[model samples]
Target: EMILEWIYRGEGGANLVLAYAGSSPLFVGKVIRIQKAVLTSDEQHLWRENNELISSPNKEVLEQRYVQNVIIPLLGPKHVDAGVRVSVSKEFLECVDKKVTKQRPLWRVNAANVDTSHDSALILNDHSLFCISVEIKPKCGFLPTSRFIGKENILKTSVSRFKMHQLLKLEYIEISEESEYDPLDLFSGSKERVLEAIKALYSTPQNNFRVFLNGSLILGGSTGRTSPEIGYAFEDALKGFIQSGHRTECFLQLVSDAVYGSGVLDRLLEIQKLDKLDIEGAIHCYYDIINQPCPIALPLDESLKIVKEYLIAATAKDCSIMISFQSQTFDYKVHFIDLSLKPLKRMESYYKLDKKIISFYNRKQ
Candidate 1:
């Protein structure tokens, strides 16, 4: 049985993709839920006749486009009726802050809609609150002309999206509507609504859970592995299963089932039926699914280590990670994998940006 809802996060969302297991494999294909690609701000353009104006994109509008075009379509309609969620990282939220501030700071601060209300945690649009699990980078100090410059301004400028993207070696960006709230607020704050909002954001998937730093690149990966980002991306997808109205204990148990119960490496073998294939054939099949040569025997410790390290780097730096699961087509008896799928092909280029800034600062000193 599948329950469908038109409203997610107090807003209307289109059905992009849905998939359900059936007796027939082909019948299990997914349904892609697509969002309306227009912006509410565009309402101003409704009657603007004899005048053409260029408007900078709004945050909500940009997110809407991504849901409609890229994210939803990828889901393939599998869980459309069952409710699917897409999300980004807290780092991504900071990126949005930086963008708005760069456009205009003091004014933008008021205008920007960062749902900052709590400390130690905040509720998000999805109606879930999560403790701040990631750390932001170091702050740079500056001499003030006046004796009474607000400390908020100093912190915002010194160790914010602008500084992280421009100075730190963060290769990804992830931000949320609540990113503007002071991190300390989550721990000790009078704003109950803000806290709930932050919690909701973490709990719900509708708040655009995605991964990318700067403009491109997905965060997360293991060393000596091909296409570490894909596994990392799937980890987010796997986390979604926990959000499905299950108790926290049940959720943790389910996660264990998904991760160690069946185990990631073992699942890879099941996908290819490696037992039946020779080493070469098994390698080819594994490559089709993951775009990497199959290890003699999949190593769980190493693979999970990749995910752990990747998250540490990603979350610490306030960045996002993206991964593309290439096309899967089966032949007469075997599934054909899409090798052309990007294997870290097009990154957002934050690595070079961070390095250049640090080098410049050092030389100046």
Candidate 2:
């Protein structure tokens, strides 16, 4: 039986999309992003005020407006097209939940209200045959200074999500309801100290990294325990290919090679490297998302320089790698998601970020 599992959820319940197997020839045996066009009043207002789209409650109008304005512009239209409106019955959704509970008891379903009443866009039909699919949260929210400097000031700034996971693993920081921590805390110690902190993050459920094989969740975020099972399973899944001996090492090698070979990041970085993109325009984009105005201002040339450096550094961060193995063909795909245009003030900033991430992987071997 085909089941739809909750792969990811955004900060607010605003943008919830589910992944499931396609039923028709157009989608059967495919990975599809069923975008539930459900939004809160605040989210609806945000879109209405900024883009002047999606103001109506009509489901068809919401789908068309969201695709034409939001998804296409942000993610590009290469992988996006007109999606089918899929109405999943309540019984079908419950059946999917029942099956998912066997693999993950914590997973739950709440689509009872959505059946036939709410329409969702059935996009991502091309992803059905992927042997491996990974979900990643690209940006780590709110910089260390954002609290005092005001949260909006640092909307364009972000740390690597992996780095955030590292902090959570070492008990250097905690993110429970009562605890409020700063991103700068990770940098308070020596390089070795910070490196140890990050390695632990890979083991925490707070880590944005997840791995799936044959569309099943092979690795998930677990808060209390960490082990090699996830890594070993990835290797076993791709046995006789890539052929790396160790678990995590093989896993990382497979993904790294896939990402670099795919040249997806290369293309994104190239677009960023273009001199024509104005930094002010990019900053305004971020502000628009949060319904705020640009907070800090700098000269155009200086802002451009800052934005360029950030783009270069970001090419190294904020990305996910999906490796699919079938027969003798090994397919690798890299998708850059959860992106905000940030400013890299200094060249050393980029250097250190790259060094830490690369060295962290190397030390794992």
Candidate 3:
């Protein structure tokens, strides 16, 4: 038997990912995913005929099949390694939760906790393997062109949905300005614009941009906000790796080159385009899929297909991209991560949220 110890690596809204730190070869270079709660009846309906997925009992097997059968096939498996599952006792989860509770951010701890009932975990390659790597939770790269969008919020077609959503946060309090980063600039297929996107992302990371040195986060906090103090500290931290003052700029250039050269974002944009109808239009299909009513068009089977595919697009829309590298420039690695399944039941909220953002946009200047 191999004894493995896990350290709190990171977490998302759905799962907590732990890193292996023991002396066993099998355990090293790996990360584990343990879901906070679990999926629901709607996901079963969402993938209606996919019995292999419907049959999975735990988050490990479910997510494993999702990545393997769904995303890897769609996006190409070159960067994907949907790792195996390992059974664990409930006590193991309890012990691990107790151990990591002190390490987790209070906010995360407050949101959810290890689902002690889950009897398994998912293992995958840790992004921390590289010396200097960058993580980006890029926003959707396309603008909605659906006719279903009302004339009141015509600006939705002009500006991106991201800044559209970002603008909504302003009504709350002292939010100074929108981030300089625009998803369209990065996806514009122009190198200089890509660099412009990079520069903007650096200014206001906001969980969208992150840098790691030896798997330890050096730039951008987990909350993903940029700090003036962290910027200077991060600049000094990179001096040895980059060997110059204003090294952060060079590092940004290297990342920009990796992004521009790799051209992975272009493929991701294509996956995002699967949401062809946009959610406003797709919401009708959502009702169609759910056997409700809204401007009916196609039969149930194909309706299920587009809505399923669009939700797949939704996963692509929400996932993160990580580019890993050594000290050199183009000698880097790129992979997509955080490809969690979006709930079908959430479609109503998605529609309402879209309407609210557009409504706010229409109300004022």
RMSD of each: 22.4, 11.0, 2.6
Candidate 2 C-alpha lDDT tens digits along 279-339: 3334433343434555635554454444444453353244332335444245554444333
Off by over 4 Å in 2: 1-23, 32-52, 55-64, 79-82, 88-123, 126-130, 141-207, 221-226, 229-234, 244-251, 261-329, 335-365
> Model 3 misses residue 196 by how many Å?
1.0
lDDT of 2: 0.41
Per-residue alpha-carbon lDDT of model 1 for 1-365, expressed as tens digits? 22122111111121111123235432232222222222222222221221221131332333333333322343332211122233334554444333333322232234334432111111111101111011111111111122222333333233433333333332332222222222222212234432442332223222222222212223211111213354445344445323432333342232222222222222222222212322222223323333454342446343333322222222222311111211112111111111011111111233234335444444434
TM-score of 3: 0.92
| True lDDT of residue 101, candidate 3 | 78
TM-scores of the candidates are 0.21, 0.50, 0.92
Give lDDT: candidate 3, residue 139.
75
lDDT sort, best first = 3, 2, 1
Per-residue lDDT tens digits for candidate 3, residues 293-360, read 77526777777777888888888898988888874444677888888667788788888888888888
Top candidate when judged by TM-score against the true structure: 3
> Where does candidate 3 stray beyond 4 Å?
1-5, 38-42, 172-177, 222-227, 294-296, 327-330
Clash totals in order: 74, 4, 2
